[PDB]
């Protein structure tokens, strides 16, 4: 069985290149531990450029840069940081003009958070035609096309890893042949790696039987609609697996309306809305990102590079399972860990 | 020097064969006929439907197809049988292909020899609710694929071509009355690479 897909899985990559697993594990350990300052001072401050999407309602990227900068400081790395923002709805010509700002700084490291398919020309230009070291965020599955020359670092919270942790928990709690339904994201990548990964594992390890599955429009409304449609046609399920936050919270409302709170349901990601729902007992389980890990990891990778140590190609931040049985003390402790740098 | 342009041409013909089948598979899977089949299960209406699409573009059809719901296979077109792909092997193919919209290379033994296949699935959707009713599978069988070898030779204007997997020939375009046979060929080697995944497959072309 050889899937002919253009990306390495995260675990697949670490298995194909065993030394990469050792490097990734060392980075994981350094990220959790207290800072160990740079042991090889630089003659000048390093130049870093970061490309973020503008006009974001969430503070995900604000926290990310806060965590990155704080770790650099605590590691005694002198730097000059240039931030570059693209307009999400602008066309490709306009965004590519904005990205010139990232090249004008003549960076030693360029951190890039935008989609690498849409902006493939830019990222391949950085790899093929510049002397900066490219760090990609929101991707943990190395591009096979770049096998001969990979970016300096890929970071993110791997979708398959998070989904497998959820599959393991569902597998422990429910007996073999348990009936379940799945609410996907919209058709595409997220549904493939969060949804079909989960289905594959619980079917293989626990013999669970999928009763129904629905693609959604990735909104609370569509998750609500899909849950109602699913339960009208397939009421005899013990849980629903949801691939995203808003979809899950829509299904939660559907469960309350139908008086089917006996059906267990998960979140995905563990943000503030989910954790509120967990504490109310509206969501039964979720997988929570330790947000600040990726910002800290990028700083540690740079440190190792400045110390002439080998740096892993890929890194996925830590996840923690959270359930409605967890105490408020436990959830607060997880929040403080996830935001250990970006808070305050 | 000129080994490069020949390799790129035959790999483009190879890719275009599967891209065309992929495009039909996606479009056929949106069809109202297949969706209605999940309810009434009328094999005669379904078979006539697939006969008509294959008529228009005969070269770009799969060697076999089958449909599943979430429990298992509910229909196959009957073509798998003579390839040695029995019902238990079909069930295994359905289990192995666990992601949609992606070709899988599968090399599996049967009672009548090894079968080297490219297989993919697409979800069958209810356009109004988003329900996944099940999956549609398409399989290309590479072994002794007369039509495919003939198309690779014809469109690349080379004299002949042999498909190989780990130095064992799977198919060839040789008519039979030429100065050489397949074993003698085993001039240009072209590894089959799909989405930058290296496979055990190789295309051997004869230009001299």
From Swiss-Prot, chain A:
Lineage, top-rank taxon, reads Bacteria
Is Transcription regulation one of the keywords UniProt gives this record?
Answer: no
Q: Where in the cell is it found?
A: Periplasm
Q: Name one GO cellular component term.
A: periplasmic space
For this protein, the record's SUPFAM superfamilies field holds: Periplasmic binding protein-like I
Q: Which Gene3D superfamilies match?
A: 3.40.50.2300
Q: Which InterPro entries match?
A: Peripla_BP_I, SBP_2_dom
Q: Which GO terms describe its molecular function?
A: DNA-binding transcription factor activity; transcription cis-regulatory region binding
Pfam families xref list: Peripla_BP_4 (PF13407)
Please provide the record's keywords in A-Z order.
Periplasm, Signal
Stated family: Belongs to the bacterial solute-binding protein 2 family.
Function of the molecule:
Binds to the signaling molecule autoinducer 2 (AI-2), a furanosyl borate diester, (3a-methyl-5,6-dihydrofuro-[2,3d][1,3,2]dioxaborole-2,2,6,6a-tetraol). This complex then interacts with the LuxQ sensor protein.
Q: What is this protein called?
A: Autoinducer 2-binding periplasmic protein LuxP
UniProtKB/Swiss-Prot annotation, chain B:
Q: Which residues form a coiled coil?
A: none
Q: Which domain of life is it from?
A: Bacteria
Signal sequence coordinates: none
Q: Where in the cell is it found?
A: Cell inner membrane
Q: How does it assemble?
A: Binds the complex formed by AI-2 and LuxP.
Summarizing the function annotation, the protein's role is: At low cell density, in absence of AI-2 (autoinducer 2), LuxQ has a kinase activity and autophosphorylates on a histidine residue. The phosphoryl group is then transferred to an aspartate residue in the response regulator domain. The phosphoryl group is transferred to LuxU, and ultimately to LuxO. At high cell density, in the presence of AI-2, the kinase activity is inactivated, and the response regulator domain has a phosphatase activity.
Q: What is this protein called?
A: Autoinducer 2 sensor kinase/phosphatase LuxQ
Q: What gene is this protein translated from?
A: luxQ
Span within the full-length protein is 51 to 271 of 859
């Amino acid at each position: 069985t050889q899937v002919l897909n253009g990306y390495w899985g995260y675990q697949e990559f670490l298995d194909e290149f065993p030394e990469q697993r050792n490097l990734t594990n060392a980075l994981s350990e350094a990220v959790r531990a207290q800072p160990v300052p740079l042991s090889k001072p630089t003659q000048r401050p390093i130049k870093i450029s970061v490309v973020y999407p503008g006009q974001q309602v969430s503070d995900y990227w604000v926290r990310n840069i806060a965590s990155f900068e704080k770790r650099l400081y605590k590691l005694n790395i002198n730097y000059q940081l240039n931030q570059v923002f693209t307009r999400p709805n602008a066309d490709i010509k306009q965004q590519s003009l904005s990205l010139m700002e990232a090249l004008k700084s003549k960076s030693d490291y360029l951190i890039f958070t935008l989609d690498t398919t849409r902006h493939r020309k830019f990222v391949e230009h950085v790899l093929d035609s510049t002397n900066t070291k490219l760090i990609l965020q929101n991707i943990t599955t190395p591009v096979r096309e770049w096998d001969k020359h990979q970016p300096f670092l890929y970071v993110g919270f791997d979708h398959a890893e998070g989904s497998r942790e959820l599959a393991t928990e569902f597998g422990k709690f429910f007996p073999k042949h348990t009936y379940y339904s799945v609410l996907y994201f919209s058709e595409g990548y997220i549904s493939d790696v969060r949804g079909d990964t989960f289905i594959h594992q619980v079917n293989r390890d626990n013999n669970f039987e999928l009763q129904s599955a629905y693609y959604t429009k990735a909104t609370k409304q569509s998750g609500y609609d899909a849950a109602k449609a699913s339960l009208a046609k397939h009421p005899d399920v013990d849980f629903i697996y949801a691939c995203s936050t808003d979809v899950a919270l829509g299904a939660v409302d559907a469960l309350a309306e139908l008086g089917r709170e006996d059906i267990m349901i998960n979140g995905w990601g563990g943000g503030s809305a989910e954790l509120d729902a967990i504490q109310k007992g509206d969501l039964d389980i979720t997988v929570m990102r330790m947000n600040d890990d990726t910002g800290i990891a990028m700083a540690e990778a740079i440190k190792w590079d400045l110390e002439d140590k080998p740096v892993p190609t890929v890194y996925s931040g830590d996840f923690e399972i959270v359930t409605k049985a967890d105490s408020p003390e436990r959830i607060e402790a997880l929040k403080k860990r996830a935001f250990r740098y970006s808070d305050n | 020097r000129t080994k490069q342009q020949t390799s790129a041409l035959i790999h483009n013909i190879f890719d275009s064969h599967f891209a065309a089948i992929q495009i039909h598979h996606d479009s056929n899977s949106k069809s109202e006929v297949i969706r209605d089949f999940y309810t009434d299960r009328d094999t005669d209406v379904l078979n006539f439907f697939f006969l008509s699409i294959d008529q228009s573009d005969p070269s770009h059809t799969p060697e076999f197809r089958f449909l599943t719901d979430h429990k298992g296979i509910i229909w196959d077109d009957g073509n798998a049988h003579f390839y040695g792909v029995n019902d238990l092997i079909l069930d295994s193919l359905a289990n192995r292909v666990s992601f949609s919209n992606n070709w899988y290379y599968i090399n599996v033994m049967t009672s009548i020899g090894s079968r080297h296949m490219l297989v993919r699935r697409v979800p069958i959707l209810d356009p109004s609710t988003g329900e996944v009713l099940g999956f549609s599978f398409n399989a290309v069988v590479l072994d002794n694929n007369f039509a495919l070898m003939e198309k690779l030779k014809s469109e690349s204007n080379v004299d002949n071509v042999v498909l190989v997997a780990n130095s064992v020939p799977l198919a060839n375009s040789l008519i039979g009355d030429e100065p050489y046979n397949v074993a003698d060929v085993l001039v240009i080697e072209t590894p089959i690479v799909v989405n930058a995944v290296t496979t055990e497959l190789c295309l051997l072309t004869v230009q001299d």
